[model samples]
Target chain A: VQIVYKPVDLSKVTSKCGSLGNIHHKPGGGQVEVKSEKLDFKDRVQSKIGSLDNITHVPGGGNKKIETHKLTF
Target chain B: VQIVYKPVDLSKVTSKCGSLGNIHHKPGGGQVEVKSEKLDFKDRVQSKIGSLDNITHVPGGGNKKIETHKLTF
Candidate 1:
């Protein structure tokens, strides 16, 4: 599974668990989660990308891959 | 292979893949990777925590564990 970090609004990302499971506010803000076992990273990116427009895929395997796209601050 | 966010520096983290593998500037900023298979989260902490740090563990099964820490800026 892959964890994609989005610096936008953590609340924007819908999740099953609240703050603890979904959004985090330390060590730099970004939502992180293991890619769902049901889908590949690309499939996930394609699925949840709804009209959110500014998302990008970082080219790396582990950690430090959240800088591929410039998000709104 | 857990993703840790140290807002201080991205380049300091060594990686195996190139731009496509490590160091990204995107939706947000943070380093991430599935925790290595050999060790659990706590075990990872015990091993790599080089003597200088303030690390905490969040209780959850998926994404969003970094916020629990207020790492160096």
Candidate 2:
């Protein structure tokens, strides 16, 4: 989820919203909130199949962790 | 640039396009093309500023190379 407050007119902007990800607005200083679900059943299945694994952090920062995969044909 | 040809009605689908990227269609089949300038002028500036560098290939596949940076606050 992400929330951004911008000083702009709400009606002048369109929002992006969907299960892929969504954004909506509540008037008053152009308050916009974004929500997203980043997983699907296929992803879970891939995890079980040894195709997905998490890599946490980078060499210098402990700020990122997500899936890694080996793609073969 | 990316091009995908799908078997769907061209008229029933929408395209995504802009300086960021774009898509469109040719009748008879659903053909989508995505094109974008991966580098903005600021990206070039960053390359000259010692903030951007390239990483070539993954461990097992020689397929990807692009700019990378360290985010510092």
Candidate 3:
């Protein structure tokens, strides 16, 4: 019932979009592709970032946190 | 006379090397200009660095290192 509906959606998203069913027929599963695609888009925006990434701001690790840690003068 | 000879010879020799005198003078009092020129060259090399700078290695910070970091492993 509920289990059937989830698989249907998973394949509908994963099948045309990717290879979930193919894996079950093999040795892995849909968890990898599903999460990767979703998280990928957001972080990619962060990863590819912009040319001004550090110049504009080192979102992650640039000791000079003019935005967050304004501890300097 | 010999005392005069040394100064006079130096002046004559230095004059023949007019640009040399200017270079010496420019270097002597023009510490800023001289160092600036050398530093200008080095800084330009720093600015020029390479196509890599950040890509080859963000001396400070560049996006490629993070994204490419993701891609590798």
Q: Which candidate is the best by DockQ?
A: 1
The best candidate by lDDT is 1
Specify the poorest-scoring 10-residue window by lDDT in model 2 chain A.
A49-58
- Chain B TM-score, model 3, reads 0.12
- Kindly report, for each predicted structure in the order presented, the TM-score of its chain A compared with the true chain A: 0.14, 0.14, 0.11
lDDT of each: 0.28, 0.21, 0.15
Model 1, range B1-73, lDDT digits (tens) per residue? Answer: 3343323322322223322222223333443333222322322121221111223332222222133323231
Interface RMSD for each of the candidates: 24.0, 27.5, 36.8
**Considering just chain B, what TM-score does every model have?**
0.14, 0.13, 0.12
- Per-residue alpha-carbon lDDT of candidate 3 for residues A1-73, written as tens digits (9 for 90 to 100): 1111111111110111111111111111111111121211221132321121111121112222111111111
**Runs off by more than 4 Å, candidate 1:** A1-54, A64-73, B1-14, B18-73
After the best TM-score superposition of candidate 2, give how far the Cα of residue B2 lies from its true spot, in angstroms: 46
True contacts kept of each: 0.05, 0.00, 0.00
TM-score of candidate 1 chain B vs. the reference: 0.14
lDDT of 1 at B17: 30
Q: lDDT score, residue A59, model 3?
A: 16
User: Alpha-carbon error at A47 in model 2, in Å?
Assistant: 8.8
**Selected candidate, larger DockQ, 1 vs 3:** 1
Docking class of 2: incorrect
* CAPRI-style docking class of model 3 based on DockQ: incorrect
Candidate 1 chain B has its poorest 10 consecutive residues by lDDT at B43-52
